[PDB]
Design a protein around this ligand. Structure first.
Ligand SMILES: Nc1ncnc2c1ncn2[C@@H]1O[C@H](CSCC[C@H](N)C(=O)O)[C@@H](O)[C@H]1O
Ligand SMILES: Nc1ncnc2c1ncn2[C@@H]1O[C@H](CSCC[C@H](N)C(=O)O)[C@@H](O)[C@H]1O
Ligand SMILES: COc1cc2c(cc1O)cc1c3c(cc(O)c(OC)c32)CCN1C
Ligand SMILES: COc1cc2c(cc1O)cc1c3c(cc(O)c(OC)c32)CCN1C
Lengths: 335, 335
């Protein structure tokens, strides 16, 4: 059976969830076989080859996002204390975790790089009224959404920079720089970390959170010709999954102070919550999307893409009870 | 059975090798249980706690050493291509490995920190006649031994600094700094790496080789009250076994370029060769030591200490076919 065949059935909703999960799990299983080496000697050779290679290198309506994601439309792994923790509670808990680990204090200047729909920006601005908080995003729609929310919440300490971070030039420095699930999209990491360091003083801290594998790094791309999934989710070679330790080798310009991971079940529960919420609001979602997309068929295509992303993410992050793919966090100071 | 009881039998040669190996293997097994955590989250918490803690902190006659060790009296893990590779061949192969990985080139100034009996110093000086090679050791006997060997080998490009490296002050810089199995003895690693960086220019490289565990760090000390071994081998708290990645968190002053490990079977074969050679030359060894030690009993004590070190090292490094304790190597440049 070809890719086209599987893709055809998928788009027609003719693959049941059980089979879909099974198929995607197997694709990730093959990635694990690709990434694990028989000896630590070989593991490090493999990992260093990857690190060396790095050193050489339409928008959805907000009503739809509100129908699929949690309250602040967080698009990153959340943190679930309990089995019954809601996605809204999990977003808040993860915002609080970042504030704790990045050592946020009232009065600081804070920059959130690739801030998305600005959940973290709004959380810090509300919690710490004397902080000034800047979000940076390359999306005009996201900028507009954040500014509207800040206005509704009576927050006067928020601004948003609309920029491609890789092109942004500024002399401005910040007490705290946060990068939540943006670094996976960065084509040139050494240059990225260097740029960030120029926006820090000797008193600043940099906090990065990124999806990872605990042992090895990989580009998010087809493992072989039987992998219909990877390229469906990201039709471009634009996402890298760093190992949990990969950024330790990018200390040219910043110096590590602390290092954590969060078990993958938290991310698994995040994507599960999104999937279930989308499913609950399926009819509403289809109504919202129809104007901007033009046909029920294009609508179905967008929904299938997002739903499959969640189904696949579930298998990826829940693999071996969260002990394969997970979330890495690091705290750095400037050199 | 108490420590005293086991120690008594050991000193009397009443513990057979099979039982001795079994006992020491069990001690290391308990260390593995202590060091491995159930989740990567917990593993990193454990490892970072260790790294944070670090950031707060009679000579044997040469004739005896010649009778127990290989030709250049290398006192570090060697490299064995084949089952029949001799200790002399393995010393040379490991010297060549260091030259390759540290990117030694003719004409460079080279500093070997804690150079021991100077095998590496003499190897580089002979292979690269336009290099100047300096060994640094805190032992006057080692300095004297190296200078004698340099004279016998018609080497004119060797000097030796007699110094405690932690106290040595100099404005001199070197193209290459090598640290082979010395860092395990360094009480203040952050300060050590900082000092090394002051002896480098922008063109220099620093190569470190250290005994490690692939996953976690530990002080070499009694795991519990049943551990007679650890404190027998090092009666002081003076040896730390860093994890294979521990030095990645010490890039305040230097920046990593490359990272390897060498499987533990090489070290296992090294200590095995020493043990077998000592055993072969047992009578001669006892004759050599008697003058300086004063009695057959003191002689037996020194021999038992060294032989047990080799027997225990065998169990440590061969554990799980070399995939627990092993040798880590890193290459760095100056910040
Ligand atoms: N070059 C670039 N400049 C700015 N933002 C970018 C970027 N490349 C990607 N991004 C944005 O980075 C974000 C990563 S998704 C995470 C969003 C937010 N930090 C959250 O946790 O919810 C996306 O919004 C993506 O579009
Ligand atoms: N503070 C210090 N200053 C200088 N040398 C030291 C030192 N602490 C330990 N050493 C020496 O460092 C050496 C580590 S043993 C390894 C010796 C040599 N590099 C080899 O590979 O054979 C020992 O000689 C030890 O006595
Ligand atoms: C679950 O695994 C991944 C998830 C995401 C990703 C890469 C992943 O591996 C990058 C995507 C993305 C988005 C929203 C979102 O909610 C996401 O889930 C966290 C992701 C929006 C677009 N870009 C940033
Ligand atoms: C095998 O495991 C270890 C070995 C050694 C060590 C710590 C170890 O864990 C430190 C000792 C030491 C010595 C000679 C020698 O040949 C050694 O074997 C490599 C060691 C001399 C004294 N100091 C440096």
């Amino acid at each position: 059976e070809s890719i086209g065949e599987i893709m055809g059935k998928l788009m027609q909703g003719e693959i049941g969830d059980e089979e879909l999960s099974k198929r995607i799990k197997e694709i990730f299983g093959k990635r694990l076989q690709w990434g694990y080496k028989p000896t630590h000697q070989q593991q490090l050779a493999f990992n260093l080859d990857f690190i060396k290679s790095l050193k050489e290198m339409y928008e959805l309506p907000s009503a739809f996002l509100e129908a699929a994601f949690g309250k602040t439309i967080k698009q990153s792994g959340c943190y679930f204390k309990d089995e019954t923790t809601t996605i809204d509670e999990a977003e808040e808990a993860s915002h609080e975790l970042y504030c704790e680990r990045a050592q946020i204090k009232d009065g600081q200047t804070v920059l959130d790089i690739g801030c998305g729909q600005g959940g973290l920006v709004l959380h810090i601005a509300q919690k710490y009224k004397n902080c000034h908080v800047t979000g940076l995003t390359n999306s005009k729609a996201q900028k507009n959404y954040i500014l509207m929310q800040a206005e509704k919440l009576q927050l006067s300490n928020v601004d948003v920079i609309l920029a491609d971070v890789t092109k942004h030039e500024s002399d401005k420095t910040y007490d705290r720089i946060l990068v939540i699930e943006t670094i996976e999209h960065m084509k040139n990491i050494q240059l990225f970390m260097k740029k960030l360091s120029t926006w820090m003083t000797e008193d600043s801290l940099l906090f990065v959170d990124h999806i990872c594998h605990k042992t090895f790094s990989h580009h998010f791309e087809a493992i072989d010709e039987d992998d219909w999934y990877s390229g469906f989710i990201f039709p471009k070679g634009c996402v890298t999954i760093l190992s949990a330790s990969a950024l330790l080798y990018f200390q040219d310009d910043v110096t590590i102070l602390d290092h954590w991971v969060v078990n993958g079940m938290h991310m698994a529960r995040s994507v599960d919550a999104w999937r279930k919420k989308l499913d609950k609001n399926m009819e509403l979602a289809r109504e919202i999307l129809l104007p901007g997309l033009g046909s029920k068929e294009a609508v179905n295509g967008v929904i299938t893409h997002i739903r499959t992303f969640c189904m696949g993410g579930y298998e990826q992050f829940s693999y071996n009870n969260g002990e394969e793919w997970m979330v890495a966090q690091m705290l750095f100071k400037k050199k």
